[PDB]
Write a protein that binds this ligand. Sequence first.
Ligand SMILES: Nc1ncnc2c1ncn2[C@H]1CC[C@@H](COP(=O)(O)OP(=O)(O)O)O1
Ligand SMILES: [Ca+2]
Ligand SMILES: [Ca+2]
Ligand SMILES: [Ca+2]
Ligand SMILES: [Ca+2]
Length: 379
Amino acid sequence: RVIVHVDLDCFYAQVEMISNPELKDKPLGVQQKYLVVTCNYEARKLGVKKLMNVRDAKEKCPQLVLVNGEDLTRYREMSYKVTELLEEFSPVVERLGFDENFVDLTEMVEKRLQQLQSDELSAVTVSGHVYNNQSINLLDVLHIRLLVGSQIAAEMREAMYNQLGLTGCAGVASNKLLAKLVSGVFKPNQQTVLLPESCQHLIHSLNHIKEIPGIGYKTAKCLEALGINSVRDLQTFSPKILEKELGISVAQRIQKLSFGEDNSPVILSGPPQSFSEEDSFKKCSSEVEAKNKIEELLASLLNRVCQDGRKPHTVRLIIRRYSGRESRQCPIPSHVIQKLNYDVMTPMVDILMKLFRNMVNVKMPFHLTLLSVCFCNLK
DNA sequence: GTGGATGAG
DNA sequence: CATTCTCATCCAC
Ligand SMILES: Nc1ncnc2c1ncn2[C@H]1CC[C@@H](COP(=O)(O)OP(=O)(O)O)O1
Ligand SMILES: [Ca+2]
Ligand SMILES: [Ca+2]
Ligand SMILES: [Ca+2]
Ligand SMILES: [Ca+2]
């Protein structure tokens, strides 16, 4: 396969610099509550880190311009514009978070090679960096295939910049793991292509186990408990003991990843399968409060159903108690689903408060720290 | 289907 | 560690 991973540069900060170009010459960070969730490259050179506490950021970089990024409407809107632009190149585009997309270019590459003539194959040319500086063998089929990929990735980024004013990086490789690992080698606004003989050099470069996809905090804790603390430890661990510890498909998967093998296909994401709205806070402790919060969250949600075309057939309420989340969910009554000029707030809040009182014993003190509404089962 | 664990940015 | 504010998959129930 030829796979591309496209990753937008400091995405939230970029959207803000487009929303307000008075900002693009200054160090800029996007704040959510007490965290600077991301910042532009001017800020990073001054020592601002992703997800940095506001106190640390004020002390380190008092010049930092901070814009509030708690409302994701604009980021979400730009995000979908990006994947839909990419869907002009191939029908199958896999989203990861708001600012990453994978595309399987192998169909398109194969078409381009068929169209190619004898004299200008000579004469195929790289777009962007070649990982680890290795030289292209224009006589190697796989090399040619990846170079054509790099040219497409270049056209993708050109379309993005022209149509949307957005800059990002791309990585081109034989699978999703590798494409995503290589896209960030040169940052920001650059692209790199991974040729197969230097794949092993790329996986060697990983310093920590949590740098493998799908190995989060909990999985790393499990592996730590089996004596596996590093990537080489994982490569080196008995497959059969690991299968009898994590399960067959998880063990085989995460072990393949550590040798750079990833056969997962690129899957079309499409529109969200669920919309939610949420807010975190120090204390909710009353039903009256937690009602007003829900009404607010629900109001935002209803604006988004309206946009979208499909109707939710279920609603989910989510809480976080002081000191993970809890949810209940239930079906939305058929008569409420036909809403779109009527009063849907009242029966919807009625349902959500029943869900709330099911989870929270209001006859006794409580103390929430997050509330989310969610619409799912979308038809 | 429902609700919790765990992954992604 | 999560934290933020989302969105997704897996699986016992
Ligand atoms: N739990 C999390 N882990 C990692 N990133 C997160 C998390 N929560 C929010 N984010 C945001 C913070 C940075 C952002 C992705 O990077 P961004 O696009 O801003 O910069 P880059 O140019 O480095 O790709 O994802
Ligand atoms: Ca990014
Ligand atoms: Ca990681
Ligand atoms: Ca989907
Ligand atoms: Ca995480």
